[PDB]
Structure formats: structure tokens, C-alpha cells
Design a protein around this ligand. Structure first.
Ligand SMILES: O=C(NC1COC1)c1cc2[nH]c(-c3ccccc3)nc2cc1NC(=O)c1cc(C2CC2)c[nH]c1=O
Ligand SMILES: [Mg+2]
Ligand SMILES: [Zn+2]
Length: 313
């Protein structure tokens, strides 16, 4: 009730910044998440008994994959935390609640393979969900855990508020399907520059929350260079593994996933930053100005990758 979580000073201070790294100590991540909830939302938003129980069941349902794991779950949620804290008059009570949970759950039960690979493998999830295959699985897993005896952190909400916060969460999680992001940022670009962007339009809020989600999901390109560079090892470990499985199906993988083209990774990072990361945080800064640090950090890392190519490291 009047029981709040504290962090060491350095963590207390650095956690408010966008570029915070949650550290190598797995056991502090749940305290870190609860801390962000109490500060983003209130000591009252969730019952501490239930939240802790939900947090730990979620953690257990992330797999020990190189990148799409429990560390990613909490990292993406922290980015959301910082976007919300730098924009706190813009979001409803319900949006603060459901967005931080959405981020923690957004990759539940990920196996480290793309929607594309499930589809070429003919995995049963590809028959159950034709588009955004993994992302619909994630939201389904989320509802699963929410219905475990003792786990419904939303029990105090009215019938109507409950239906809203699940609908926030669901759209939020589908949004992390990067295949949808390009269309969403383009509509957001037009609306912003023709002045028709209206945050009181619910369908506009949806688009904005979507972009927030892409921004949080890719936040590893907005960390300090040594974090970004080591996170890249984890992503390619998954990519190259999936490429190995593509070869096992008798398919040449895209170079992104072919581990015989390690040498061309810096150039591949360059195009990604140009085609995705920079446009994403640009458009996000245009809508939510206090999120400028993400664009500045992304740009800085773009600059580091050009240096890697030029043989300056
Ligand atoms: O454009 C890309 N992919 C999108 C387009 O539609 C999906 C892309 C293309 C890439 N070509 C290469 C590459 C080329 C030649 C030789 C070797 C490698 N490497 C890539 C990485 C990429 N992407 C990410 O590194 C990436 C990173 C992350 C998290 C860190 C934030 C999440 N998702 C990602 O896809
Ligand atoms: Mg995902
Ligand atoms: Zn993710």
C-alpha cells in the first residue's frame, strides 16, 4: 500500500533517461519494472500481490533466445516509461496502465523466428493467424496469463474500462509487427504535415501509440554505442539461426540472415537505420517533441556504423 520500491542512486537517476540500460542482474528487472509502474501510474494502479505474480508468470513464458527474451521485454517497457514520463499530460490513466503492460508482454513466447519463417515452415501458428502471426500469438498469450487465478491486475476496472484497456494492449502489440510500421508512419507523416493530426481522434491516437510501440521496440539503436554494438550480436545470432533453418528447408535466406555474409553487416545496419530507425524516431519527434533524445541517440549510432565501415573501428 504505502510500500514503494527504491533503486540505488545511480539507477534511480539514470532510469529517467532514454538511454538507460537495465543491467546484467536478472533479479533486479522485476523491481525495476514495478518502480516504473509506481512512478508512471501510481502506487495504486495495481495490487502489488497480483502485479508481482503477473510479472513473474510473464517472465517465465519468455524463452531463453538470444534477443527476444525477458531482457528485451523489460527494455522495451522502460523506453515506454520514459516516453510517458516526458509526455505525461498527453495520456489517459488507462493508457499509462495498458501501455507498460503491453510492452512487457509484447513478445511473449517468442521462439526467435520471423513471421516469414513460421509461414515457410508451415507452423500451426501460421494457419491460426494469417497476418502478424507472432504478434497475435503474443496478445493471445497475454490474455492467457491475465486469466490465471490470482493474475488479473485489471480486476478493479469497470466492465467498460476493462474492455478499453485490453483493446489498447491488443492494438499496441499488433503494432510491433514491423510489416505494419511503414504504412503507419506514412499516414502519420501526411497527417502531421497537413495539420490534420488530431490527438482527440481515437484512430489517430491508435496510430501514435503504434509508432511509440515501434520506437520502444527498436530502442536498442538509441542506447549508448557500446550497448547498441553488443545488442547487435544478439539480433544476428537469431537472424543467422533462422537463416540456417531456411537453408534446412532448402531456401536461400535473405543476406540479413545468411551467416556467410557476416562481413556485410555494417552496411546492412546502415540501410536499416536509414530505411527504418531514423524515419521512425524522426516522425515520433515531430509528434512528441520531448522524445528528441531517441532521434539524437539513433543518429549518433548511425554515425558509429559509418565509422565501422571506414575502418575507424
Ligand atoms: O531493414 C532491415 N530489416 C527490416 C526490413 O523489414 C525488416 C534489416 C536489413 C538488414 N540487412 C542486413 C545485412 C545485409 C547484408 C549482409 C549482412 C546483413 N542486416 C540487416 C538488418 C536489418 N534490421 C535490423 O537490424 C533489425 C534490428 C532490430 C532491433 C535492434 C532494434 C529489430 N529488427 C530488425 O529488423
Ligand atoms: Mg516481436
Ligand atoms: Zn520486440
Amino acid at each position: 500500500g504505502l510500500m514503494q520500491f527504491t533503486l540505488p542512486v545511480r539507477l534511480c537517476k539514470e532510469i529517467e533517461l532514454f538511454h538507460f540500460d537495465i543491467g546484467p542482474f536478472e533479479n533486479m528487472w522485476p523491481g525495476i519494472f514495478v518502480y516504473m509502474v509506481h512512478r508512471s501510474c501510481g502506487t495504486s494502479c495495481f495490487e502489488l500481490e497480483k502485479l508481482c505474480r503477473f510479472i513473474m508468470s510473464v517472465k517465465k513464458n519468455y524463452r531463453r533466445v538470444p534477443y527476444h527474451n525477458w531482457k528485451h521485454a523489460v527494455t522495451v517497457a522502460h523506453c515506454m516509461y520514459a516516453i510517458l514520463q516526458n509526455n505525461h499530460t498527453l495520456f489517459t490513466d488507462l493508457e499509462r496502465k495498458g501501455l507498460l503492460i503491453a510492452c512487457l508482454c509484447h513478445d511473449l513466447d517468442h521462439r526467435g523466428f520471423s513471421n516469414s519463417y513460421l509461414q515457410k515452415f508451415d507452423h500451426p501458428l501460421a494457419a491460426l493467424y494469417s497476418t502478424s502471426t507472432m504478434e497475435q500469438h503474443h496478445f493471445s498469450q497475454t490474455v492467457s496469463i491475465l486469466q490465471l487465478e490470482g493474475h488479473n491486475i485489471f480486476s478493479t476496472l469497470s466492465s467498460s474500462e476493462y474492455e478499453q484497456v485490453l483493446e489498447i494492449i491488443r492494438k499496441a502489440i499488433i503494432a510491433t509487427d514491423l510489416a505494419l510500421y511503414f504504412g503507419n508512419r506514412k499516414q502519420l507523416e501526411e497527417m502531421y504535415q497537413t495539420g490534420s493530426l488530431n490527438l482527440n481522434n481515437q484512430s489517430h491516437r491508435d496510430r501514435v501509440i503504434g509508432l511509440m510501440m515501434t520506437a520502444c521496440d527498436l530502442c536498442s539503436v538509441t542506447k549508448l554505442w557500446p550497448v547498441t554494438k553488443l545488442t547487435a550480436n544478439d539480433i544476428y545470432a537469431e537472424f543467422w539461426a533462422e537463416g540456417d533453418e531456411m537453408k534446412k528447408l532448402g531456401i536461400q535466406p535473405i543476406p540479413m540472415m545468411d551467416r556467410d555474409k557476416k562481413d556485410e553487416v555494417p552496411q546492412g545496419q546502415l540501410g536499416f537505420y536509414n530505411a527504418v530507425a531514423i524515419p521512425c524516431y524522426t516522425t515520433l519527434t515531430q509528434i512528441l517533441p520531448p522524445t528528441e533524445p531517441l532521434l539524437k541517440a539513433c543518429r549518433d549510432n548511425l554515425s558509429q556504423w559509418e565509422k565501422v565501415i571506414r575502418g575507424e573501428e
